[PDB]
Design a protein around this motif. Structure first.
Motif: not given
Ligand SMILES: [Cl-]
Ligand SMILES: [Cl-]
Length: 162
Positions: A31, A49, A69
């Motif tokens: 990420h 986040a 996500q």
């Molecule tokens: Cl995010």
């Protein structure tokens, strides 16, 4: 094997802020937090986040949550992209996973840039697309991962990952 397992193999899992292959601040399962050189900025993006004051460290569940996500967003990004959607629609399940991988890694814009290879994939010219894909900065910078993705497109099987 599936997309999640595939990407967990390509990206790994790190619970503390780290620098990716490009020197950018990342966490979890690939990420990206920020392209900014500042670790604070990274920490700030991380907290926002996750939704808590993390101090640069997250748990496994948090990491998997960002991961879900991000995969979801990648698929949806392909489906909204005029250049990508048709390619994706044309492919079998295995190869769709290869395209999602690339988008997860380089973004849709980046992938949409492989115009020629994309046409070739849509035409089902496997070997040719594979050769074209290899002539890229992507392949030169992360050759082993690139090779895995490219075999997947070439063969339509998960062998590269077994
Ligand atoms: Cl995010
Ligand atoms: Cl690599």
């Amino acid at each position: 094997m599936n997309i999640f397992e595939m990407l967990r193999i390509d990206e790994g899992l790190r619970l503390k802020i780290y620098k990716d292959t490009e020197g950018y601040y990342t966490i979890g399962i690939g990420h990206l937090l920020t392209k900014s050189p500042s670790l604070n900025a990274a920490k700030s993006e991380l907290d926002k986040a996750i939704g808590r004051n993390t101090n640069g460290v997250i748990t496994k569940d948090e990491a998997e949550k960002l991961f879900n996500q991000d995969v979801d967003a990648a698929v949806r990004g392909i489906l909204r992209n005029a250049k990508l959607k048709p390619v994706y629609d044309s492919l079998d399940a295995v190869r769709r996973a290869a395209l999602i991988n690339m988008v997860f890694q380089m973004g849709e814009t980046g992938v949409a840039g492989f115009a020629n290879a994309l046409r070739m994939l849509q035409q089902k010219r496997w070997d040719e697309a594979a050769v074209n894909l290899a002539k890229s900065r992507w392949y030169n910078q992360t050759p082993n991962r690139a090779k895995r993705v490219i075999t997947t497109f070439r063969t339509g099987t998960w062998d590269a990952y077994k």
